[PDB]
Design a protein around this motif. Structure first.
Motif, PDB file in Angstrom:
ATOM      1  N   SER A  66      54.569  32.102  15.183  1.00 29.07           N
ATOM      2  CA  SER A  66      54.462  31.690  16.572  1.00 29.07           C
ATOM      3  C   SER A  66      54.303  30.187  16.722  1.00 29.07           C
ATOM      4  N   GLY A  67      54.282  29.444  15.620  1.00 29.12           N
ATOM      5  CA  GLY A  67      54.162  28.005  15.704  1.00 29.12           C
ATOM      6  C   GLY A  67      52.816  27.509  16.166  1.00 29.12           C
ATOM      7  N   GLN A  68      51.759  28.296  15.984  1.00 34.43           N
ATOM      8  CA  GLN A  68      50.428  27.931  16.436  1.00 34.43           C
ATOM      9  C   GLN A  68      49.410  28.168  15.330  1.00 34.43           C
ATOM     10  N   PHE A  69      48.272  27.490  15.467  1.00 36.03           N
ATOM     11  CA  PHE A  69      47.090  27.745  14.655  1.00 36.03           C
ATOM     12  C   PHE A  69      46.695  29.210  14.744  1.00 36.03           C
ATOM     13  N   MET A  70      46.308  29.646  15.939  1.00 39.22           N
ATOM     14  CA  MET A  70      46.135  31.057  16.239  1.00 39.22           C
ATOM     15  C   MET A  70      46.653  31.323  17.644  1.00 39.22           C
ATOM     16  N   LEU A  71      47.119  32.546  17.862  1.00 41.39           N
ATOM     17  CA  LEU A  71      47.695  32.942  19.138  1.00 41.39           C
ATOM     18  C   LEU A  71      46.608  33.562  20.002  1.00 41.39           C
ATOM     19  N   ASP A  72      46.344  32.945  21.149  1.00 37.57           N
ATOM     20  CA  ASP A  72      45.336  33.423  22.089  1.00 37.57           C
ATOM     21  C   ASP A  72      45.993  33.561  23.454  1.00 37.57           C
TER      22      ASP A  72
END
Lengths: 122, 98, 98, 48, 48, 49, 49
Positions: A66-72
């Motif tokens: 998802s191209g993110q650190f974590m998905l929130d």
């Protein structure tokens, strides 16, 4: 092209007509060597006004990335690609740089590309 | 509201700024600026050989006052005289500053 | 006149209250200016642009005897927040293994 | 017949020292400084 | 015997520029603007 | 009259305070109107209207 | 019922709840919340195409 997917036809005309994207992820089923990272970019080539930096994501590992650190999904800020109408005439572009070159072997090992699109209906 | 660190500083303007509000309160002065200028005038006078730093050091003492009470009361008396004279003359703050 | 002098809220009480408040205000101004300065430094680090300056000094102006100093800090903080909001951006993420 | 007038003198302003870097991010420091400035404003109003 | 009266003149109002798009969702911006307008109201009361 | 002129809260102090507050108010109004405009734009995007 | 709290969509069908994530502490009502168990209404599952 986004409109060529005919997502609008996957559900009956009722239940709401305002259907917009919420999140996009992508999986690359390819053989990647250890300690090696894929390098890809997903970009939106449409013309709808977007908040700054919410029109492109980067791909490093490619396993439901998802191209993110974590998905929130409860983030106070807009997620990338949020607000794009599913019936838009724009197109999503996947770019692999230096694939001539360094990323040649990985692209040869590549089988196909999978996109996961989560959207909402109102 | 005081400490030894500002007692040893050589900046008498800063010490006057620090002590102005309390002097104004204890002399019924109009504003802290008037108190600061009165303090500067008194420091120039040097009533009992006490400057601003000497007064500030004398304040920071646990009643270890043998004969320095004379210096302290003389300094306070001169300050009160100056403030009362200024109040009686109704001198403006600008003239006093100049 | 005699009753006016024996009042609970006589001249001495008011003088002492305003002197103490003046001292408290004088120290609190320094504290809050230091806080604003570190906030500005944090913003500069966030935007990676050392050229932005919002605390330009002159908040404590002698003409107003230092009153409404806090309004200038409020305006400066509002400008800082507006600049941060307008120039904010969602950054691309990249992970590299070496 | 006598008369009187107001007299004004030149007045200066405060200066700015170089700032320091804290450990927290921007918004939290912003909120803390906002609270402190509100307290300062209340002090000024009481003084007046 | 003389007399005096008040005089009034035509006065205008402010205009609106096109807005800009931020990054946060609606409620956060709502609360921030609420705080700012509360501060503005306090300033106006002090002025009066 | 002389005492009235030498007051701490004389005419000059009030004039300077209200002038400074007027300038602060004038700038703060622009800032808060810009904030309200971006909030309205966010709402428009949320409702897609 | 509150708007939009009367229907859910099924995509994968493995203990699916029709949400990104299920949070029972949500500030908003969950779908189908508040229906009396003894109600005379009916739940309909529809598979299109």
């Amino acid at each position: 092209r986004l409109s060529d997917l005919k997502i609008f036809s996957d559900y009956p005309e009722s239940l709401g007509n305002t259907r917009q994207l919420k999140q996009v992820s992508v999986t690359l089923p390819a053989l990647v060597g250890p300690y090696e990272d894929i390098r890809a970019v997903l970009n939106y080539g449409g013309s709808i006004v977007m908040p700054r930096g919410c029109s492109a994501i980067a791909l490093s590992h490619g396993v439901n990335d998802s191209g993110q650190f974590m998905l929130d999904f409860n983030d106070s800020r807009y997620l990338p690609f949020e607000g794009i109408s599913v019936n838009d005439s724009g197109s999503l572009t996947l770019s692999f740089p230096d694939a001539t070159d360094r990323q040649k072997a990985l692209l040869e090992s590549l089988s196909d590309i999978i996109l996961h699109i989560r959207y909402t209906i109102r | 509201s005081i400490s030894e660190d500002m007692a040893q500083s050589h900046n008498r303007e800063l010490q006057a700024e620090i002590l102005a509000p309390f002097i104004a309160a204890t002399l019924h002065l109009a504003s802290p600026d008037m108190a600061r200028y009165i303090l500067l005038w008194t420091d120039n006078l040097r009533p009992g050989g006490l400057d601003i730093a000497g007064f500030m050091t004398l304040v920071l003492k646990e009643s270890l006052n043998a004969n320095e009470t004379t210096q302290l009361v003389q300094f306070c008396h001169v300050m009160a005289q100056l403030s009362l004279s200024v109040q009686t003359l109704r001198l403006s703050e600008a003239e006093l500053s100049v | 006149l005699e009753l006016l002098q024996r009042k609970f809220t006589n001249k001495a009480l008011y003088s002492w209250m305003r002197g103490k408040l003046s001292a408290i205000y004088y120290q609190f101004f320094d504290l809050t200016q230091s806080f604003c300065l570190m906030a500005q430094e944090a913003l500069r680090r966030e935007l990676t642009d050392n050229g932005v300056t919002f605390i330009r000094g002159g908040a404590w102006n002698g003409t107003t005897a230092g009153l409404m100093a806090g309004e200038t800090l409020l305006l400066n903080l509002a400008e800082m927040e507006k600049v941060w909001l307008e120039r904010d951006e969602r950054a691309l993420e990249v992970t590299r293994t070496v | 017949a006598l008369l009187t007038s107001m007299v004004q003198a030149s007045q200066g302003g405060s200066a700015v020292l170089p700032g320091t870097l804290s450990l927290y991010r921007f918004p939290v420091m912003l909120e803390r400084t906002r609270n402190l400035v509100a307290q300062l404003t209340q002090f000024g109003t009481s003084l007046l």
